[PDB]
Symmetry: C4
Subunit: 388 residues, 4 copies
């Protein structure tokens, strides 16, 4: 086995095809399905799996009461087979904590979980299912990380962390791991003014992370990482097609080096694929809440502050709840290009559906096609009334 | 590992022995058993498995309400160990969709799932558990496929698709895949006037598919495929032993090149083994509904429009519900011949049993014996009253 | 991998130690545990497993109603990990039927299941998880077999079958299989007058089977099989220590070549280890019913019609229900001798406990020790009242 | 594969990081989770697993009534994947009994279970999942062992057993096993006056076991084992930081060679890492009951009768129930040192919480870090009221 190298460009994205969907909430109405949130997808060289943070209880279990809560001692990063739901009997625990990232380097998988109280949190880095390194909070204010997969190149797997305020300047760091060991870390540089929950992907040009500015900006900050030199830059997506939520309406001039104003102290984890004329952006349909999801083809969105959509695809209808969204790719697939993929978290329960006392989600996932495929919409599909 | 080649003839069929039965509905009265329909069986070189389209809910789950529905976003092709029931915890998702086929080529398995709305459906072709190719609807009217296993020869796995009307002329295509890639496709040729849900098997003479004419014919259309030349022909089973359902009574002259008339706009997926004097046909016992199942030995049924049965075997009593039936064989078994096998879908629930609000099924499966074995009958075995 | 050869003698049996116990009925009060009966244990070269005939329903399931029934289309031979209970999610189906045997030859496992109606039953022989040969009923009266493991030598695995009356002369055959193929079969010879449900084990002296005479004898018939010559002889255990159930009291002279009289048309499957001064016999404690179980050291029981016990061990108290018992050994263990093992079926429910409507069992298993270990008793442990 | 050798020293312990937590009681409120107690953790070279003694019933099962009981025929040592809960479907039975130890020697795992009545108990030694040796009670008064992992060096795995009184002088033996065979055993020597439930770990200096004096001492007895010479010595932890429970308040002079007095005929299984200036001791926070848990850095605790803490870490708050605690290490991890680990048993139910009729537990586990990480507290997390 060799470390994987990012040697391919992205496949041309002409549409998106269904890749995975677990229907977890539907099935969990009558099955031992774990309550989760903050899910993602990540591939090994021989298998792709669903990942999420469990709440240490099933949905029908009485302990599901109060699972809107973000950070308890009963959370853990679990993984489970593609498109199966996260059950008590099929879920593998990667590590314990309430914020996570995970990626395979071609030889073995690194998983990182953060746990602790707000002022004394710590990250534990697992490599090949063993704890290897630990990192203590540096700002003493909810040390936290990506909530989607990291990406590796020749053994080096960069990870973005934030520690500090969610509503002001915070201390963001980029760590560079190899076999779970810390090679190097650096403070965030560039023009991004606030960084949360980076969604990343890799290709020959390097590693690209699309994140969340929770403080002031409804445009998304971007961090571009060189995994060989172990350095990075940051800015925003220049495009006036704004992709955070909640957000103002799309203007005609975006902002490259500062937050686009209108909504403060809120946001959602999201993603984009930034690739010249092959650029696609994901966003919720609603500008007010985490509902609906669509992909928009926006040529040169990263660099062009006038850029608008020329093609699109609805993923989830606005009538249906969405949530976090993030990127991943099967870096070990056949062919000459990397096929862009993403997942959307379909949040059910609180705060939007408060007739139940829990909060959970299911997953839908798509990958790009070079065909121009017909589109459908993909709801969670559970009826809240059944849980009453 | 090498691609499998169709080098053997069929074993002599003197009777049928029990091969597999999951008792899914009985067990699912009190277990987390997924609601399914459209099941089949398919073998890998080291394992044979049950396949079906899940409805993304268990039977006892409240979301089982309304599972008579054919095409939702909550369906997926699942596979599970032979004769076990399809449970939440033991079922592996092959792909997402509401119509499917799957087959192993000796090296890896290809699975195809179709999804989307009626006018914008698309097929995704998976090979070795990764998406490889995609096909958009060409007639914009429920792009759909076999609902039983395909067959491969030297890496080439032909698959039959239909897109268009179910009650008139439709656009049927034969696709030829290798490692999930499209080598070639061709429009349906020959004398078959309507094609649905082909059940196929392979032997040295080529690949034989017995399908369903839903439009006008109660005799079954046959497609014979050369997987080397990648061409095919079509006709009907000439025999007056009619095998669709519903159907007229058996006349004394069948039809080779046109539908036998009497029942329009209906039918059931079925199968046959067409092999000269070793020919056996499957059919429901009832001519009015999907109840009972029997095998009939009808020499030269394919070519002889006067041919009648000389031997038979009851599989399911007429008092018991049946459903879809299809062919498969263990192409990797020991010996000098391929042992013909089939499954019968035992549909429980709606529309025939409407005291419950769900629709599901169990599976029974048989293979041929060169002995003349005693016969039994194989009901689903669940009591509807228990679910009330 | 090589075929296993019976090259060792039995280890000296000075006592019995606990080997396995699944507590299936206790656990199945609140878990998806399959209803079973007729269990056994059998080893592969890398694993030992529990085996039993499922009833195609869980205990709490409403379909457990009526599981006193012996032969339905919903039964199957299942196997599952040692000391785990037989659950819906962990049980592997070996074949479909209501009477069975199974054994590994060192290369692969042969499993045989019989199914059908009383007058038209058939056996299907599976080898390496594929059906290989089939045998039709020869007496048309419940073709049936061992209900415990067979034994192999150099690829040859003898199996005892009976077809015909249970209350009169029947047609017993000894079949000799290799890789699932029939090498030879022969009619029962010797002085045993009726044969049911043989429990067998192998050692350098050959294969020894202790069976059940259901017709007239409360002593047990013995069949001794030469697996190289593929021949056998039969007689009874000469000892006046009688081991069937129900049975008369122990006299002072047993019978070597005819049934010991007193109880007609009844009996239980049981076993013995017949090895000169190392002979141990198993029996129920009660002479009237399937309750309790004890092992008795009876030197030369096979040949000495005056032989009495000189040592013993209680396995299950007379206050507790027992049932079938049979032999197995780990033929692939380290050392210079084969360690004698056995299981006892602990039957719960009907007909003895008719407040519930089901019939099932758990398993307890022991192996011999060269130490003189303290003894305990091993009840099923479930409280019937909980199921009410 | 080679036998593992203890060639490394302990890593420097500057703090403790979260390693594993199963949340078993929370999840078992609504899942088929086995009732357990006396858990531990033990590693294979490719996997680390949770271990515990099952009670042969789930928590919601009615048979959970009365599981405060220590020694029934329905107990078994089970193991299951790290941080998953012990479920009916994911738990592997290692052996049958009500007291246990287990360890991997680098080639295969040895497991030992004791069973029987108080006056006739016996140990069965399993190696590579097969029973190899048996040991009968020598004092006829609850033959019993460690309840946490043993440790091996070059194939030799020492185990501590006690047989006899819990409230007076008993017969403690140290056994030395290789591949499950008894190489040697010896009577307890040294100054420890009573030995129960040793928690052991290995490093280049040998094997160190921290045990429990149930008779008179609230300081802990220590047994130091040379696995090459197969000899040992014993004494107490000299430190006045007392670590049994219940216990007197910490004085300023401890006792090296006799029990520290104050609490008779009680105690809890616990552990320590005794390593000069790298010494850490675990104890309950309360001096009266099994509540809370903390680690204390006490330089030279083993030899210095004046030694006091200079650093510490709270693991479980005093408001939360704890229980048994013990040591383990991943002897097959990368690096130049062995990372000290421990688990704490979080007992829920009786006798402290008698509104429910059962007794069970969950597990929390930690390993050492060379960082000085922030601390959290780790409760079981279940609400008793939910089970009412
Ligand atoms: C079967 O399946 C297929 C495959 O999915 C289906 O085909 C798909 O159909 C959908 C639905 O229409 C399409 O999605 C939309 O795409 C358009 C972009 O394409 C249009 O515009 C292109 C660009 O035009 C500009 O440049 C060209 C030159 O480059 C110039 O000629 C032109 O004049 C103009 O200057 C055109 O090139 C393009 O034409 C091409 O494609 C046509 C088919 O689409 C074809 O007919 C032509 O021949 C040609 O080939 C086409 O005209 C996106 O604009 C659109 O996204 C907007 O609208 C949706 C609502 O539907 C909304 O959700 C989006 O967010 C977005 O609108 C918001 O943002 C805008 C940008 O800021 C803003 O301007 C809007 O006002 C709006 O903003 C408001 O809402 C948002 C969101 O809440 C909020 O944030 C704001 O603040 C504000 O409130 C769709 O993505 C697919 O592209 C199309 N795919 C294919 C392959 O055809 C087919 O329909 C299915 N069949 C059936 C029977 O169902
Ligand atoms: C233990 O197990 C064994 C093994 O299973 C059991 O043995 C089996 O028993 C069953 C039940 O009888 C048999 O199935 C039937 O087979 C017959 C065919 O065999 C008969 O006919 C043969 C052909 O005869 C013709 O040609 C020969 C020369 O070739 C000529 O001599 C003769 O005069 C005639 O011209 C005979 O060769 C054959 O004899 C041989 O076998 C005998 C045993 O069967 C043996 O005794 C002889 O010595 C000799 O060796 C025998 O006579 C099928 O015809 C039949 O299928 C029809 O009937 C069933 C109802 O049972 C029905 O469901 C079928 O659909 C079908 O009938 C419909 O279709 C017909 C064709 O279109 C039509 O003509 C009918 O009117 C009818 O149509 C109506 O219903 C259908 C369906 O709803 C509907 O679609 C129509 O519109 C319409 O409404 C059975 O398959 C097995 O073959 C037999 N197996 C063996 C190995 O023996 C044994 O019974 C068990 N033991 C116990 C104790 O239970
Ligand atoms: C800790 O654990 C250990 C290990 O388990 C426990 O030790 C065990 O204790 C049990 C219980 O006693 C023993 O089981 C019994 O074994 C005896 C056989 O051993 C006795 O007899 C031997 C033979 O004596 C004959 O020959 C010798 C010369 O060879 C001659 O000297 C003698 O006079 C006589 O002629 C003796 O050798 C033996 O002595 C040796 O062992 C002694 C310890 O046992 C020791 O003290 C001595 O020093 C010496 O070393 C000993 O005396 C079995 O006979 C007995 O089985 C019968 O009884 C049980 C009831 O307990 C019954 O269930 C059996 O079915 C059977 O009785 C029925 O069948 C008989 C034969 O047909 C019949 O004659 C009876 O009338 C009776 O029949 C009735 O009931 C049955 C069943 O329902 C029915 O079918 C009939 O129709 C009828 O109604 C037990 O198996 C273990 O052997 C012993 N093991 C060891 C290693 O010691 C220890 O107790 C535990 N400690 C504690 C504190 O609990
Ligand atoms: C973020 O996370 C971090 C990391 O966890 C948190 O930092 C941790 O904070 C905790 C809580 O304070 C600390 O745990 C305690 O550690 C002390 C030991 O350290 C103190 O004492 C050291 C030794 O001093 C002695 O020697 C030195 C020279 O060697 C001499 O100078 C000195 O005068 C004295 O002679 C000091 O070296 C040490 O200072 C160092 O560290 C400081 C930070 O701690 C730092 O500020 C300094 O600059 C310097 O670097 C420090 O002063 C333990 O003593 C203590 O354990 C006792 O107390 C707890 C209650 O909290 C109790 O549960 C324990 O059982 C124990 O107390 C019992 O036992 C004693 C011994 O027998 C007895 O004397 C007591 O009376 C008491 O006995 C009673 O209760 C018990 C239990 O029920 C019963 O059995 C008895 O019978 C009786 O009833 C704690 O373990 C961590 O060490 C510290 N870690 C780090 C890395 O800093 C941080 O707080 C978090 N941040 C936030 C915002 O929350
Ligand atoms: C990636 O690059 C390194 C260094 O050039 C090489 O040694 C390694 O084999 C490469 N990995 C793969 C999968 O080729
Ligand atoms: C099938 O035929 C091809 C081409 O003749 C050959 O290369 C291949 O090995 C064959 N497959 C098997 C299983 O023999
Ligand atoms: C199924 O759904 C319908 C509503 O469409 C409802 O009237 C009916 O009662 C439901 N059945 C059950 C079992 O609740
Ligand atoms: C058993 O005997 C045969 C023939 O003598 C030999 O070929 C085979 O290898 C033996 N099996 C084993 C496991 O040694
Ligand atoms: C441990 O030591 C022995 C004897 O010196 C050696 O043979 C063995 O290989 C060692 N084990 C390992 C894992 O190196
Ligand atoms: Ca924002
Ligand atoms: Ca038709
Ligand atoms: Ca009898
Ligand atoms: Ca004590």
């Amino acid at each position: 086995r060799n470390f994987n190298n990012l040697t391919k460009g992205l496949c041309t994205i002409n549409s998106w095809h269904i890749y995975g969907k677990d229907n977890a909430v539907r099935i969990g109405e009558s099955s031992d399905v774990l309550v989760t949130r903050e899910p993602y997808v990540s591939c090994d060289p021989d298998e792709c799996r669903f990942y999420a943070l469990s709440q240490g209880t099933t949905i029908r279990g009485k302990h599901s009461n109060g699972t809107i809560h973000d950070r308890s001692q009963y959370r853990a990063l679990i993984s489970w087979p593609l498109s199966s739901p996260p059950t008590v009997y099929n879920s593998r625990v990667e590590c314990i904590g309430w914020s996570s990232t995970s990626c395979h380097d071609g030889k073995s998988r690194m998983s990182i979980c953060i746990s602790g109280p707000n002022n004394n949190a710590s990250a534990v880095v697992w490599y090949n299912r063993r704890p290897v390194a630990e990192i203590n909070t540096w700002a003493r204010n909810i040390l936290r990380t990506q909530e989607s997969e990291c990406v590796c190149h020749n053994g080096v797997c960069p990870v973005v962390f934030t520690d500090g305020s969610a509503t002001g300047p915070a201390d963001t760091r980029i760590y560079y791991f190899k076999e779970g060991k810390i090679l190097k870390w650096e403070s965030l540089t560039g023009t991004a003014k606030h960084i949360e929950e980076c969604s990343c992907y890799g290709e020959r040009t390097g590693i690209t992370c699309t994140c969340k500015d929770n403080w002031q900006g409804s445009n998304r900050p971007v961090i571009q990482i060189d995994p060989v030199a172990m350095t990075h830059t940051s800015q925003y997506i220049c495009s006036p097609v704004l992709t955070d939520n909640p957000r103002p309406n799309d203007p005609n001039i975006g902002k490259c080096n500062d937050p686009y104003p209108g909504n403060n102290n809120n946001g959602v984890k999201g993603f984009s694929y930034l690739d010249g004329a092959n650029t696609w952006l994901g966003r919720t349909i609603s500008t007010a809440s985490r509902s609906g999801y669509e992909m928009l083809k926006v040529p040169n969105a990263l660099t062009d502050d006038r850029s608008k959509p020329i093609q699109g695809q609805t993923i989830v209808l606005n009538a249906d709840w969405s949530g976090y969204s993030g990127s991943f790719m099967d870096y070990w697939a056949e062919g000459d290009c990397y096929r862009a993929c993403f997942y959307v978290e379909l949040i059910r329960g609180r705060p939007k559906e408060d007739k139940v006392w829990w909060t959970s989600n299911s997953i839908v996932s798509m990958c790009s096609s070079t065909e121009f495929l017909g589109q459908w919409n993909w709801p969670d599909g559970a009826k809240i009334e059944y849980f009453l």
